Design a protein around this ligand. Structure first.
Ligand code: FAD
Ligand code: NAP
Length: 511
């Protein structure tokens, strides 16, 4: 029914910028879609208390508009969900993007029509769009992982998942249980502890966590940032992780024990997860001894913060210090509160939930009014895998990604022509907005090139896609241990630009 140049799926950072680029810069008629009733993406969905960025406020945003960077403000060194949502809502209205989005609208299929070199895209309300290009900015919020504890139906109190937090809902003065201690669960717990009648935490795997050091800013302090913003973004885009600190090249074991502690202590006092992992020493992710030095420093902090050694034993992180580091606003301190109990479910599993609360295998009823699930989601490619997406010859995305999801360059995959991914598989591990910008700017250039020239279809070769996996795999082999590209933002940007400069190396082009 509707003939458009381009379709964008999602209205988070990625979809917002994709619609801007395609509409404003390339002059294409572009429609965006989100199941959400408004823009924001993950910042629209996740409204739990204590929801906070792990990227400093001044860097958790777009950098493409130099005037916008002068204009935005923020209250603290890290940024909260309502502030981010407001920022993204403001971007949408600043660039008049709203009239291009269809909200409350799920894309249920995207089928390639081989004969016409078009994508046929349908919504859950039956609307059909024919488009030359599809840009998928669908994020990771797939189906909500909402675990199957026996007797859950019987609970007479409120059951809440953090990705569907009730707007009014304050749990002040209530008896609350939280299941899950990832970034989200830690954040909810710290938020809840001081206001809740009682808090019971069901801990399965304690994680490494460092202080975030979220502090109020002055208007003079924002003024300093803003006067140097160009240099700041120049540095970020020339770094590996783009978080606003100088990345260390210092081997942890090349200095004395006393200096190593001082270095760790400084980062601990300053705050920041990536700063702790990458700002202290150059080999925490690559050297077993370096990782142990970091890991055991955090363990010692846990033991020092938590008074009761039985409580401390349950919360004690173990093993390698890896993946996205967690940071917190006083998470370990919380367990020193008289009205907070930790339950280590590996050794004392949940037997059932009843009307009144949770019974553990010890046979003790933990009486609760409220049960919070901070249990995350199931999958990461989940959002691709639940849409009927069909490429060339009717090849389904699930048949194509028979094993793990793959991409060429993080943005495209073979047999799916003119179909792009923002933050697809095998892409950078990074402060995300500047990587998102990198990918959308590259997607847009590639679509510009296709439109300028005669291009009917562009897709990666199977061999390019395989060499990219091999490339990612060889970077990942160096590290300690989903497959990301781990060469960093600066390296990723050079790779993307060179692919473009080399006449789209690794793409099959139908002229
Ligand atoms: C609490 C929290 C804090 C975070 N902090 C940071 C941080 O500090 N730094 C950082 O770099 N990253 C952080 N992240 C990661 C974050 O996801 C990214 O920074 C960024 O918001 C991702 O934007 P996105 O557009 O790629 O995806 P999303 O924001 O996830 O948006 C995708 C949208 O696509 C929509 N969608 C999916 N499928 C369909 C469909 N079939 N039809 C219609 N719509 C669909 C969804 O409804 C969703 O709104 C954080 C995440 C969380 C949850
Ligand atoms: N960039 C950011 O600052 C940021 C912030 C928040 C979230 N995120 C991302 O968003 C995703 C969601 O984060 P999240 O913290 O909500 O989820 P998460 O990281 O997957 O954490 C889930 C927690 O729930 C526990 N759990 C899962 N199933 C359980 C069950 N059946 N019974 C008991 N416990 C169970 C897990 O323990 P186990 O460890 O044993 O599985 C874990 O503690 C993550 O992938 C994360 O990377 C990013």
């Amino acid at each position: 029914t509707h003939t458009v140049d381009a379709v964008v799926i999602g209205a988070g950072f990625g979809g917002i910028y994709a619609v801007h680029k395609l509409h404003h810069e390339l002059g294409l008629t572009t429609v965006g879609f989100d199941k959400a009733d408004g823009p924001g993406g993950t910042w629209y969905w996740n409204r739990y208390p204590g929801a906070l960025s792990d990227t400093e406020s001044h860097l958790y945003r777009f950098s493409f508009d130099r005037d916008l960077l002068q204009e935005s403000t923020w209250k603290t060194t890290y940024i909260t969900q309502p502030e981010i949502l407001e920022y993204l809502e403001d971007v949408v209205d600043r660039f008049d993007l709203r009239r291009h989005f269809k909200f409350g609208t799920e894309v249920t299929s995207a089928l390639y029509l081989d004969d016409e070199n078009l994508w046929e895209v349908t919504t859950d309300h039956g609307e059909v769009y024919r488009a030359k290009y599809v840009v998928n900015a669908v994020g990771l919020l797939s189906a909500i992982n909402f675990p199957n504890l026996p007797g859950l139906d019987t609970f007479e109190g409120e059951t809440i998942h953090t990705a569907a937090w009730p707007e009014g809902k304050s749990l002040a003065g209530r008896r609350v249980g939280v299941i899950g201690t990832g970034s989200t669960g830690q954040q909810v717990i710290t938020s809840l502890a001081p206001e809740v009648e009682h808090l019971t935490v069901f801990v399965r795997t304690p994680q490494y966590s460092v202080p975030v050091g979220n502090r109020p800013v002055n208007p003079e302090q924002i003024a300093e940032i803003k006067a140097d913003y160009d240099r700041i973004w120049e540095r970020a885009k020339n770094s590996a992780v783009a978080f606003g600190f100088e990345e260390s090249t210092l081997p942890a074991m090349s200095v004395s024990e006393e200096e190593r502690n001082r270095i760790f202590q400084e980062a601990w006092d300053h705050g920041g997860g990536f700063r702790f992992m990458f700002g202290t020493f150059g080999d925490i992710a690559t050297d077993e001894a370096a990782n142990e030095a970091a890991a055991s420093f955090i363990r010692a902090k846990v033991a020092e913060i938590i008074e009761d050694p039985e409580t401390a034993r349950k919360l004690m992180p173990k093993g390698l210090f890896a993946k996205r580091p967690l940071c917190d606003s006083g998470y370990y301190e919380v367990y020193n509160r008289p009205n907070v109990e930790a339950v280590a479910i590996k050794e004392n599993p949940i037997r059932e939930v009843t009307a009144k609360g949770v019974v553990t295998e010890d046979g003790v009823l933990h009486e609760l009014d409220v049960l919070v699930f901070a249990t995350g989601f199931d999958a990461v490619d989940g959002n691709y895998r639940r849409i009927e997406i069909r490429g060339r010859d009717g090849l389904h995305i699930n048949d194509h990604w028979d094993g793990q999801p793959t991409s060429y360059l993080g943005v495209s995959t073979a047999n799916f022509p003119n179909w792009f991914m923002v933050l697809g598989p095998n892409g950078p591990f990074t402060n995300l907005p500047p990587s998102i910008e990198t990918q959308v700017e590259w997607i847009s250039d590639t679509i510009g090139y296709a439109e300028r020239n005669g291009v009917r279809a562009i897709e990666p070769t199977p061999e390019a896609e395989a060499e990219w996996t091999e490339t990612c795999t060889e970077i990942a082999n160096a590290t300690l241990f989903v497959l990301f590209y781990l060469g960093g933002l600066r390296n990723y940007r050079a790779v993307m630009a060179e692919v473009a400069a080399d006449g789209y190396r690794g793409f099959e082009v139908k002229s």
